[PDB]
Design a protein around this nucleic acid. Structure first.
Ligand SMILES: [Mg+2]
Lengths: 99, 1110
RNA sequence: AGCGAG
């Protein structure tokens, strides 16, 4: 658990994107946009958030860590799994298929 | 909670309102309802004493009264009553007789004209009974009736979109129990239409005029929509009789239409209980959905025209787009489509329901035979005893408890496996989805499953989603739905009142989450409290005015999944595999309670039923390795008898040993003798092993495991396996088979151990091929070859005229001989017809862990053992302690089960003990730690409940303070990694290695049962291509994919060899054997026998197939 | 029927 480093800017990023989520929720509450449009906008917001937190995690890690060493030496695994392990797992699929 | 329990300290930060329920209640409560026991009577009277009726009482009441066609006389049933069980549980399990009790029902025959009543008990039959452990004993075997998940009968509204028009078209399906489907579908054309019994559609107005409605009435009720007016206009059917005539001409064509058989047709099809029983659940669901008879109790499940009319009105209102309708004389209900997979529509047929349905089928058959004979019954010469035939009922019950798919062979690898075989909800079986016909939308997880069915524990084969496990706190509604507890939070103030809500009621309430901090005043200490809503969507929250809250974390997990520490750090796949693999652990000889566990260990062991618990308080009078006699507080004394070295269904050991001294005072419900996989009363499936997480020389390559030899020397991963071999001397044409030590032609060496009476002695070691039971069946005169007659004359012998059919230790097996059980007709023991003796020999072997055996932790980290190293070439800490197991670091990061690593660290801490240095207050990371966890003595068992546990910061802190082993030397730095010395080279490894204590189980996939080989053996009957299976001497299937692979290689000769002489060609087979044994060349292969079989099959299909030479 | 590997 000491070889898995969380990104130190995570909470600031989460706040910055929850602000946009709250703005979208307000907009929905005022009838500005229908349910589908609000869902799509929130999906886009949180997708961008997951991308940003993944970038922060990638740039924070040392190049010697066993996790990143295994992933980036072609031995096995991709960086999406490393992001899932440390940072944000991201959006999840509905049982129907949607996000 | 439990009187005497190990003191497992917990990292739990949340108090639990509700204690875990009686995990086995799912079975026992349902069976008690079926019987109608006083306990169920009281439980129901507490919660609806208006109409407590048992399952058998319900069946009898529905059946009675019966009358003939004329109605001159009638028969009735009443007062079902059970006698004492025939034999005790253990004796029933021993002598292969079902554990059942007689069933008596008071009949009553009334000759309506003459006026006589004749009543007498009728002995409906030997009803199998459920053992206190929630399981049946049938033919000596142990069986479990697993609850079934079924579609609840009722009215279901659906909406779809048509491509050809892109218009929302709705539909309804009144789904009865054994009825005829009526699907009021709406097509793209604006006209509603019925489809009775799946017969070529109809305009609804036709049925309405068949129900006797006038077009004026039809527009009076279904008049608001344009679709209805359109249907009336385009219907063209003018008149009630016209509609009835058309309906009869469509429903039952080929017979002369009339008026009588036009009206009574529909009346019998729908509104007579003879053919359209909705059942109580079905009628209740229809009433609730349509809001017709909400207030009134339920009776006469049959429909009324009002119900169909309301269904049509609801469908039309839904198509229009309305939100609520108020039927005249009915409470208004919301108009919305139904979801078939919602747990407000998936009901549980528990054991009681299934047994009652089988009793109902048997009683219908008995009813039919009664009616049929009643015509040929001499009046006044008949009594219910001579009028009732119980054979159909007992036959139905017997054919259910055996060969019914929901009556499954009890799965006892360990107590957890049996416990989870109970509490299992299978979505397939009689009247349920089949794997092939089951779509892909039923296997998924639904938001309604939360708290009612485990989303994790589930088979990983071609059964994922069809079989699940009931959650820990889940309960079954009297109607069959699954309820879950919730804390009623009032005015933002959380309470203790635990309301059990079904899925429907949960949807109507804005239910909060368990780990929502409470200000200690009962009120939420923050706005923005996480919540769920009706549509299953987890989203933002309306602060305050949330109506309900989760009782506790882990409400959504089952018992098996509740025993995985650090579950929240494991991906759903790995958690699923760990849950499914905890149930495969074999019982070891010793069993050790895990250092890192949960609160479910003790309760799981107690409720599994394989651990002895004192019934009442008292002082242990005398304890020995075979029984415990306890003196109660008032005079009486009771003796619990342990079950020593008994064989479970799956071949494992079922040893029980006491855990109490000869003077201890023990309270009621206290564990006094641990079971197979139990340690001091808490479940123990495996062993804690010192583990390193490095890659080691490529022996732990790709999920392979390398174990120290200490684990084989100290015998820590070792399991007793008991295998039973059965052989029965029968009665044959030539005579009878004898069991004696006179086996023909076999020497006096392999007849050595066999007792004076045949069967081998107890304690006689036997290896594969040895003789267990010496049996000799007659041969009858045959024709000895000239060569053999000459040889017999030369060696002076006789044919003996009796062949041998002795029982022998099958190939690849070994072991001692625990005991022999001999049943015999001569001693008047029940045996099948035409058998004189039946002897069973129990052979026990102590299996030691060896390469090829499968191991696993609790986090889905499975693997076979690649190597077993000597202790000396084993990495050892600086102290000198060798590591026991070595897992690979390449399997952790990508399988996303980091929880194991967490466990490892915590395990090490628990093994070493810790002291948080609270010199100046408590460290900020330990402020929220529960008191008394600041100091733990070495080897201190701990618990991390499922979703509240040891946070990563707390684990970091406890890892920092890890008070030293024996001298001042911390072998594990704050990072959790230890500097290991190489066993072979001797130099330290250049970098520290993650070392700790992992609790790993020995799965029941041992290589001894997996190895198999064959050179020649039995061949199948119609075709050659030898029998398949290790049980026989089976050849390995060489399928079509393998044959394509061989064709791609271009290797024509090996493929021909395989498919001709190795498999099928019956002449080249003995020829290849001769060639191999004599050193000659392997001969040319011939025509496979299967091809000639095919030619004969084709010819017998009147297909002239001929093989032209050229 | 349960169960294993992919
Ligand atoms: Mg595999």
């Amino acid at each position: 658990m000491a070889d898995v480093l969380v990104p130190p800017r995570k909470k600031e990023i989460l706040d910055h994107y929850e602000e946009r989520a709250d703005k979208v929720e307000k907009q929905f509450q005022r009838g500005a946009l229908n349910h589908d449009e609000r869902n799509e906008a929130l999906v886009e917001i949180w997708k961008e958030a997951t991308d940003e937190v993944g970038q922060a995690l990638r740039e924070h890690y040392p190049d010697d860590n066993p996790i990143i060493t295994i992933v980036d030496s072609g031995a096995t695994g991709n960086f999406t799994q490393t992001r899932t392990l440390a940072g944000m797992k991201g959006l999840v699929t509905n049982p129907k298929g949607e996000f | 909670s439990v009187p005497g329990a190990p003191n497992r300290v917990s990292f739990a930060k949340l108090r639990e309102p509700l204690e875990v329920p009686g995990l086995l209640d799912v079975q026992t409560d349902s069976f008690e309802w079926l019987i109608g026991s006083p306990r169920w009577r009281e439980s129901a009277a507490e919660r609806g004493d208006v109409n407590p009726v048992g399952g058998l009482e319900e069946v009898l009441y529905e059946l009675s009264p019966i009358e003939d066609f004329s109605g001159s006389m009638s028969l009735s049933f009443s007062d079902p009553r059970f006698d004492d069980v025939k034999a005790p549980v253990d004796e029933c399990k021993d002598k292969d007789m079902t554990y059942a009790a007689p069933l008596f029902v008071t009949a009553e025959f009334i000759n309506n004209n003459t006026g006589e009543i004749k009543s007498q008990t009728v002995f409906m039959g030997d009803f199998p009974m459920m053992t206190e452990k929630g399981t049946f004993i049938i033919n000596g075997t142990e069986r479990v009736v697993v609850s079934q998940l079924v579609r609840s009968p009722g009215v279901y509204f659906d909406e779809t979109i048509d491509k050809s028009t892109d218009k929302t078209l709705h539909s309804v399906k009144v789904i009865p129990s054994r009825g005829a489907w009526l699907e009021f579908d709406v097509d793209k054309r604006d006209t509603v239409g019925v489809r009775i019994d799946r017969k070529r559609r109809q305009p609804v107005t036709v049925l309405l005029k068949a129900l006797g409605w006038t077009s004026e009435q039809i527009v009076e009720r279904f008049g608001f929509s344009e679709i209805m007016r359109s249907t009336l206009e385009k219907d063209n059917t003018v008149g009630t009789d016209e509609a009835l005539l058309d309906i009869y001409r469509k429903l039952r064509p080929g017979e002369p239409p009339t008026k009588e058989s036009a009206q009574t047709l529909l009346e019998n099809l729908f509104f007579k209980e003879k053919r359209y029983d909705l059942a109580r659940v079905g009628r209740y669901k229809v009433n609730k959905k349509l809001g017709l008879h909400v207030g009134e109790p339920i009776t006469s499940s049959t429909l009324t025209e009002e119900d169909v009319v309301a269904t049509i009105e609801y469908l039309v209102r839904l198509h229009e787009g309305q939100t609520t309708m108020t039927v005249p004389g009915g409470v208004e209900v919301p108009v919305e489509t139904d979801d078939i997979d919602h747990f407000g529509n998936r009901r549980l047929r528990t054991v009681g329901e299934l047994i009652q349905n089988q009793i109902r089928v048997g009683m219908s058959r008995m009813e039919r035979v009664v009616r049929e004979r009643m015509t040929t019954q001499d009046v006044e010469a008949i009594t219910p005893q001579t009028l009732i035939n119980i054979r159909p009922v007992v036959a139905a019950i017997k054919e259910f408890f055996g060969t019914s798919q929901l009556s499954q062979f009890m799965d006892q690898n360990n107590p957890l496996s049996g416990l989870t075989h109970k509490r299992r909800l299978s979505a397939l079986g009689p009247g349920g989805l089949s794997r092939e016909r089951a779509g892909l939308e039923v296997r998924d997880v639904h938001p309604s499953h939360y708290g009612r069915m485990c989303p994790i524990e589930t088979p990983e084969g071609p059964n994922i989603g069809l079989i699940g496990s009931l959650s820990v706190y889940a309960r079954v509604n009297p109607f069959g739905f699954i309820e879950t507890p919730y804390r009623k939070v009032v005015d933002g103030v959380v309470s203790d009142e635990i309301v059990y809500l079904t899925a429907d009621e949960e949807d109507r309430h804005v239910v909060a989450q368990a780990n929502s901090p409470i200000d200690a005043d009962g009120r939420f200490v923050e706005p923005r409290v996480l919540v769920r809503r009706k549509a299953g969507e987890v989203e933002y929250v309306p602060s305050s005015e949330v109506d309900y809250m989760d009782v506790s974390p882990r409400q959504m997990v089952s018992v098996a999944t509740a025993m995985i520490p650090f579950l929240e750090h494991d991906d759903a796949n790995r958690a699923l595999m760990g849950a499914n693999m905890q149930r495969q652990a074999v019982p070891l000889v010793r069993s050790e309670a895990p250092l890192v566990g949960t609160g479910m260990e003790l309760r799981a062991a107690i409720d599994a039923g394989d651990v002895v618990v004192a019934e009442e308080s008292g002082v242990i009078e005398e304890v020995s390795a075979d029984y415990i006699t306890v003196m109660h507080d008032n005079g009486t004394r009771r003796t619990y008898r342990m079950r020593k070295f008994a064989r479970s269904n799956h071949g494992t050991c079922a040893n029980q040993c006491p855990i109490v001294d000869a003077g201890d005072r023990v309270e009621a419900g206290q564990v006094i003798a641990d079971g197979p996989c139990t340690d001091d009363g808490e479940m123990a499936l495996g062993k804690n092993l010192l583990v390193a997480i490095m890659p080691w020389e490529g022996h732990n390559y790709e999920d392979a495991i390398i174990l120290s030899n200490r684990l084989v020397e100290e015998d820590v991963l070792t399991s007793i396996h008991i295998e039973e071999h059965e052989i029965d001397a029968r009665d044959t044409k030539l005579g009878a088979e004898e069991i004696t030590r006179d086996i023909p032609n076999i020497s006096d060496e392999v007849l050595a151990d066999l007792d004076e009476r045949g069967i081998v002695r107890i304690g006689a070691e036997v290896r594969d091929g040895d003789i267990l039971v010496g049996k000799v069946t007659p041969k009858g005169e045959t024709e000895l070859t000239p060569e053999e007659r000459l040889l017999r004359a030369i060696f002076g012998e006789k044919a003996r005229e009796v062949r041998d059919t002795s029982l022998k230790v099958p190939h690849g097996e070994s072991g001692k001989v625990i005991g022999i059980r001999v049943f015999s007709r001569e001693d008047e023991d029940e045996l099948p017809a035409g058998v004189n003796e039946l002897v069973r020999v129990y052979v026990a072997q102590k299996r030691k862990i060896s390469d090829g055996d499968k191991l696993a932790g609790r986090h889905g980290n499975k693997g076979v053992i690649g190597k077993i190293l000597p202790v000396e070439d084993m990495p050892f800490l600086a102290d000198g302690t060798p590591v026991d197991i070595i897992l690979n670091t390449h399997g952790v990061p990508r399988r996303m089960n980091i929880g194991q690593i967490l466990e490892t660290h915590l395990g090490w801490c628990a093994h070493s003990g810790w002291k948080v240095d609270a010199a100046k207050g408590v460290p900020d990371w330990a402020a929220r730690l529960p008191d008394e966890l600041l100091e733990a003595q070495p080897n201190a068992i701990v618990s991390t409940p499922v979703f509240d546990g040891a946070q990563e910061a707390e684990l970091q802190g406890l890892l920092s303070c890890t008070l030293p082993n024996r001298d001042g030397d911390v072998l594990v730095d704050a990072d959790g990694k230890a500097m290991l010395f190489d066993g072979r080279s001797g130099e330290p490894f250049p970098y520290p290695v993650t070392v700790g204590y992992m609790y790993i189980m020995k799965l029941h996939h041992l290589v001894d049962d997996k190895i198999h080989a064959r050179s020649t053996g039995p061949y199948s009957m119609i075709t050659q291509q030898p029998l398949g299976g290790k049980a026989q001497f089976g050849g390995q299937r060489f399928g079509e994919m393998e044959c394509w692979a061989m064709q791609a290689y271009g290797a024509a000769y090996t493929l021909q060899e395989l498919l001709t002489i190795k498999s099928d060609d019956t002449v080249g087979r003995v020829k290849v054997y001769e060639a191999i044994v004599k050193g000659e060349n392997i001969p040319e292969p011939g025509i496979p026998e299967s091809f000639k079989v095919l030619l004969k099959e084709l010819q017998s299909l009147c297909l002239n197939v001929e093989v032209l030479s050229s």
